[PDB]
Design a protein around this ligand. Structure first.
Ligand SMILES: [Zn+2]
Ligand SMILES: [Zn+2]
Lengths: 5, 300, 300, 5
């Protein structure tokens, strides 16, 4: 659930 | 009648340090100081939706694919390296507008500034506040990866933040510039989840002094709470403990309300505002420090 | 999950234009463009608590009392003059960092930026919104007179505001740079009073689209209001009339809610939020344009 | 009631 910027 | 709203410190010393960093079709923001450029490492990742073997993608890196741009300058990458979750690229040109600067980490409860930049181009400026779980509430549109946080003191420029990932609740996780991630979150599109943020009591008390100064007083009680009772309650209610009355002693004499009295308010008000508002907020915000509040009600 | 908060456009092109203007012990901010400096005229007033004969204080002016400072530059006043409520001083040095710029007036409902400066030194940056009575809600600490408002479009720099007086309710009245006062308020410590501001319906509808986008929907009704009914109601309720659905047609298809449906919400919600919140606000704010909302939820 | 800034 972590989205890479 | 004043109101209580975030302000940001002017962005002029920072803007000339923000560069466009591209690799392949990966574009994000980078920070250009001296002959070096700092940026998030994922600009080299072949893909950003499953776990990357970052050490392998450093061996794999090709310097001719780097397109780093700033104004009329095109910066050639002399060498590449990791410093934590960020890249450190040495370039063939020294930034002619490098300001005196330092790096530090911002602590939970402290305010700082975000300069949100879309692929090299600075776009907006606003104030935020680091939270205990190491996240912030930004406004980070796609394009703003590697956008930079800073704070000015004395007036020493500190670079404190570089933007990396977004969690499911919308919380934003960045790193400092030594390349350590706030909160300890790993630089991967993995299942990561934010814990519970402990509210800054110092900030909340400041918030309430602001309201009093403004002439808002409906929440003030006929009773109070000792410093040691508050801390005992704070410990089991996700609030920080208060060390000293001292930073409030001007604000206390100027309103005529003791900190003890604003402590009990925090306890009651935490159960809900009951439909009313304070400084137009719907609940206690802990985003303004005692320093911010003083500075905007009284100046200097 | 995003939230809806003011942002300001970066202040870097503006900061090198902000000068310290002093006369006697009067110190305030001035705007240095080309070989000219623009500032509020009261820096020459012998006193600022009763009505000044400003034409007499222009005859009275002494150029050696002027202390205008910017970085390492001291600017000698060649000549002085009025352009409305502001002074226009010709100086012996051209600002080497003059940006391409223009002057225009901001209209009611439009957002712009304040660069708040204390006696030459820029201090903070934040977004505001011009209101129909020609006032704004600033944070103007004593020291910030002559602080400058601006907005960037395309990306043409427009200078739009220079700060002058504070009214009893705390509303702030500035002039544009042609030296005409917003709202028509005279440049005197006289009894002046703000009328009633007409709310920007375009902005409020944008606000509500933001909330929907955010996933906030409790306020949405089982009914709606035609464009022509709304305007008829708007006319007697201090809201602007809506010309076209057109600027909302993306926002409408993206949420699935028509403007007609958000019109009836405005009418009901205007009677109070009933203790709940929308995007954490306690009531309808009209401070975000449809352009601001799109840009921060979707980008570009 | 207008205060000159
Ligand atoms: Zn990352
Ligand atoms: Zn004035």
């Amino acid at each position: 659930x972590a989205v890479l910027x | 009648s004043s109101g209580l709203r975030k302000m940001a410190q002017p962005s002029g010393v920072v803007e000339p340090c923000i560069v466009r960093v591209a690799y392949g079709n990966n574009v994000l923001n980078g920070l250009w100081l001296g002959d070096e450029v700092i940026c998030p490492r994922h600009v080299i990742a072949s893909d950003t939706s499953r776990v990357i073997n970052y050490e392998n993608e450093l061996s794999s890196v090709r310097l001719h694919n780097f397109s780093i741009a700033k104004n009329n300058a095109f910066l050639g990458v002399v060498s590449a390296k990791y410093k934590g979750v960020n890249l450190v690229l040495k370039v063939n040109q020294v930034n002619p507008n490098t300001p005196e600067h330092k790096f530090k980490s911002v602590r939970p409860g402290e305010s700082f500034n975000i300069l949100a930049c879309y692929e090299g181009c600075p776009g907006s400026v606003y104030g935020v506040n680091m939270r205990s779980q190491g996240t912030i509430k930004g406004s980070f549109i796609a394009g703003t990866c590697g956008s930079v946080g800073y704070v000015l003191e004395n007036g020493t420029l500190y670079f404190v933040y570089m933007h990396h990932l977004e969690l499911g609740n919308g919380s934003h996780v960045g790193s400092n510039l030594e390349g350590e991630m706030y909160g300890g979150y790993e630089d991967q599109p993995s299942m990561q989840l934010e814990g519970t943020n402990v509210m800054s009591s110092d900030n909340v008390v400041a918030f309430l002094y602001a309201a009093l100064i403004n002439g808002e007083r409906w929440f003030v009680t006929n009773t109070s709470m000792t410093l040691e009772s508050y801390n005992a309650w704070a410990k089991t209610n996700s609030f920080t403990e208060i060390v000293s009355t001292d930073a409030f002693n001007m604000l206390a004499a100027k309103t005529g309300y003791s900190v003890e009295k604003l402590l009990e308010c925090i306890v009651r008000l935490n159960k809900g505002f009951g439909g009313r508002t304070i400084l137009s907020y719907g609940s206690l915000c802990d985003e303004f420090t005692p320093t911010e509040v003083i500075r905007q009600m009284y100046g200097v």
